[PDB]
Amino acid sequence: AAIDKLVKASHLIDMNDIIREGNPTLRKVAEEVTFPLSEKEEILGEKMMQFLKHSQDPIMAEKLGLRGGVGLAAPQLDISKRIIAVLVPNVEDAQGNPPKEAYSLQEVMYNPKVVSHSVQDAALSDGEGCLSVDREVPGYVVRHARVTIEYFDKTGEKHRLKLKGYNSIVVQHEIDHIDGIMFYDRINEKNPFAVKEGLLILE
Numbered sequence: 001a002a003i004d005k006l007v008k009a010s011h012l013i014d015m016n017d018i019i020r021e022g023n024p025t026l027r028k029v030a031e032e033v034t035f036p037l038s039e040k041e042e043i044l045g046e047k048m049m050q051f052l053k054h055s056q057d058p059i060m061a062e063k064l065g066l067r068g069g070v071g072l073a074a075p076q077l078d079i080s081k082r083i084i085a086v087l088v089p090n091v092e093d094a095q096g097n098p099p100k101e102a103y104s105l106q107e108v109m110y111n112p113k114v115v116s117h118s119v120q121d122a123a124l125s126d127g128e129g130c131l132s133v134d135r136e137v138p139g140y141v142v143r144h145a146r147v148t149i150e151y152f153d154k155t156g157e158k159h160r161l162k163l164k165g166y167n168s169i170v171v172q173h174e175i176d177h178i179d180g181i182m183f184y185d186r187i188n189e190k191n192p193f194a195v196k197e198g199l200l201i202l203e
């Protein structure tokens with residue numbers, strides 16, 4: 001099936017492995033994974049993280065024809081499993097010095113979920129994009145400002161983590177994918193740029 005092609009040792013995930021808006025797998029509730037993970041599930045997670053590293057590297061992205069990205073969920077690869085990868089880089093200072101930490105978040109998460117969140121909502125000022133959507137979609141994607149999540153890593157170890165800012169937005173976006181929700185589902189239907197009072201707009 002699709003997962004066998006994806007986990008071949010020499011196979012690199014690229015845009016042609018990513019399904020498109022309209023494909024029913026994007027609207028399903030993905031199946032939880034069981035531990036211990038199968039080798040396929042473990043390698044899939046690793047290929048997904050490799051895809052994010054490549055997409056953020058100017059040469060490899062160029063070589064493989066990749067759009068820069070900070071997250072991917074398995075349903076985007078036509079695999080209906082609760083697996084996501086997130087990779088959010090820190091940025092150089094104005095003198096060109098690399099950050100202390102290369103990434104503010106780097107994880108492959110199995111069965112992630114939000115277990116609590118802030119009453120306050122937030123949205124990226126620039127809106128959101130999606131590897132599976134080849135349209136322009138304007139508007140504020142209203143999400144929780146802060147969340148506490150739970151997930152398991154490839155070893156089966158459980159983690160509990162609080163997130164805010166951009167990291168909170170990114171994980172919420174990927175978890176939506178494993179629940180069959182798309183970012184534009186969270187954009188006001190009548191005025192994409194409406195702002196309910198108290199909405200935290202992130203630059």
Ligand SMILES: [Zn+2]
Nearest residue numbers: 012013014017
């Ligand atoms: Zn491929």
Ligand SMILES: [Zn+2]
Nearest residue numbers: 042043046154
């Ligand atoms: Zn491995």
Ligand SMILES: [Zn+2]
Nearest residue numbers: 050053054060
């Ligand atoms: Zn590589």
Ligand SMILES: [Zn+2]
Nearest residue numbers: 115149150160
């Ligand atoms: Zn709990």
Ligand SMILES: [Zn+2]
Nearest residue numbers: 115116117118
């Ligand atoms: Zn709630």
Ligand SMILES: [Zn+2]
Nearest residue numbers: 130131173177
């Ligand atoms: Zn997405």
Ligand SMILES: [Zn+2]
Nearest residue numbers: 114117143144
């Ligand atoms: Zn929620």
Ligand SMILES: [Zn+2]
Nearest residue numbers: 184187188189
């Ligand atoms: Zn709509």
